[PDB]
Design a protein around this ligand. Structure first.
Ligand SMILES: OC[C@H]1O[C@@H](O)[C@H](O)[C@@H](O)[C@@H]1O
Ligand SMILES: OC[C@H]1O[C@@H](O)[C@H](O)[C@@H](O)[C@@H]1O
Lengths: 319, 319
């Protein structure tokens, strides 16, 4: 009747139960990864606090899933998938990338979970691209073949940052002299927002403050600091440029989806930003992406919802 | 018994016959688009010099294939797919992008048709990335779902150029002044070799010669112009960076394939260039792409071969 679903990112692990018949998510609880020694220990606690027998599960984790060994870059947890499934006695245990799960949540979303940013209307049967600026920059794609939804994972957040304008080029130069390779995550993320502010200040021959991401948005929203105001606007433009590159690359006439990370915290600024202009700023191919819609997912837990969908399809349910 | 396959790009129009039972290609001929008023005229002309009755066809064309109206924009022809099919009395007439066709040639290629550049071995069932620098920059992706090879076409050659080094950033700066948005096609193509040469010369505060892509390649191999050898060396580096971004974005552990448009004319220079190092210069995710193989396709007619593969799969045959 019920299956276990999870969304683990860095220091937070979120666990919930999923209705096998319908895919509804219920009984969601967030745990702290610092207070538990392993992912397995957290699952043991959840399964007894809720008095539910569970035999199938699917956990989303924010790191590359390649083989049986899962080592978290942000967290210290590391485990073998086949051993956890045996240890917990599960019949199915699916370990997937966090944006693999987010991509799988799209067929479950209603119109009330989306806010459109330009474009006209999706083309049925054409690919879909998903990305989000959160702890890092996650990217995934989704294609419908026959009756199966096929998620295409990857590490698209670590491709080379692609500056277009002179302002964007100046950011690359300051970041390049610090770390070498500058990936898109270094600018399109929570820490990326800090990098934008630091480089904009360093370019003015000044030392940046030790500002946290939430500080930069709040000062930019209050217009109390021009360095932060510039950073936030530059972030919104780079967001559109990244998404427009994805849409061209995979011909995603099914739409481009933004899994809400830090963006919903400055949603009104985002709507008035230059995001949509940057999305279409593609030379002779502005008209190619002009009608492709863009959606922000305001669902409070797409990762849990899409973990259940991925499992149910794996178990033979048609979404 | 036979079906018609075609590969049309720019000025040329290549037509051939395809064995429906086997997928073998034969009786290929290269017509000129300047000497005929339409692609229909070429097909009508070809179908009578070879005296073969044909009902099914697949033509690959180097332009985006969005709807029924097809306009090349690299040629004067433009036509409706539905209208051309009716005129020829075909039952099936598939019209596809030229790198959709190249992507479907991959299942039919043998070891003799591949040259490996680094990486170790492909993982079965993982996505494949295909790209090629010719008159334009083509990109396609290929995934094997159940029994079917699914081609994901796109216009990925028109994404933003992504400079990494200081020398690359200069190229973007100079080209941005001349054309505005700078696509990867502007540096990674036949014409892009000239842009790389010209930006290098203008960066040196000199005036560029009116060279052609043939001039740059031959002068580079002859050590006749240091401007032209630098342009060629930077071409090979950016080729590697671009391919590495493709492998990160879609997790292409099935391999990255480079369709040779201009590469084979300087094959040995390419082998000695910094292509592989550029392919893997991806910060923390060098190890992620380190083992992914890169193959150069040395088949002289992959577009015809893949067009047959696409039509055959559409007709119900298994590849
Ligand atoms: O969490 C979003 C993304 O951040 C990146 O740093 C990770 O490598 C991805 O696996 C993850 O999907
Ligand atoms: O020929 C390779 C590529 O060149 C580009 O200019 C075209 O827009 C693509 O449709 C084509 O696939």
């Amino acid at each position: 009747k019920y299956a276990l679903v999870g969304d683990v990112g860095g220091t937070n692990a979120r666990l919930a139960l999923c209705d096998i018949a319908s895919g509804e998510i219920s009984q969601a609880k967030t745990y702290s990864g610092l207070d538990y020694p392993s992912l397995e220990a957290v699952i043991r606690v959840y399964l007894e606090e809720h008095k539910v027998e569970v035999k199938d599960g699917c956990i989303a984790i924010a790191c590359p899933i390649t083989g049986d060994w899962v080592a978290m870059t942000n967290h210290t947890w590391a485990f073998s998938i086949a051993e956890m499934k045996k240890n917990l006695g599960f019949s199915h245990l699916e370990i997937i990338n966090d944006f693999t799960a987010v991509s799988m949540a799209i067929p479950m979303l209603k119109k009330e979970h989306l806010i459109q940013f330009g474009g006209a209307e999706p083309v049925e049967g054409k690919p879909i691209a998903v990305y989000g600026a959160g702890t890092g920059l996650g990217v995934a794609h989704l294609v419908h073949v026959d009756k199966r939804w096929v998620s295409l994972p990857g590490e698209g957040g670590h491709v080379d940052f692609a500056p277009n304008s002179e302002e964007e080029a100046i950011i690359l130069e300051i970041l390049r002299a610090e770390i070498g390779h500058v990936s898109a995550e270094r600018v399109l993320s929570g820490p990326g927002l800090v990098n934008l502010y630091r480089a904009i200040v360093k370019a003015d021959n000044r030392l940046p403050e030790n500002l946290k991401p939430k500080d930069i948005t709040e000062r930019a929203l209050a217009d109390s600091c021009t360095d932060c105001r510039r950073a936030l606007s530059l972030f919104c433009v780079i967001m559109g440029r990244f998404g427009g590159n994805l849409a061209l690359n995979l011909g995603t006439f099914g739409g481009v989806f933004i899994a809400g990370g830090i963006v919903p915290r400055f949603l009104e600024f985002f709507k008035a930003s230059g995001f949509r202009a940057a999305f279409e700023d593609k030379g002779r191919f502005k008209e190619y992406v002009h009608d492709i819609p863009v959606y922000l997912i305001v669902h409070d837990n797409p990762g849990l919802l899409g973990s259940g969908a991925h499992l149910r399809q794996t178990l033979g349910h048609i979404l």
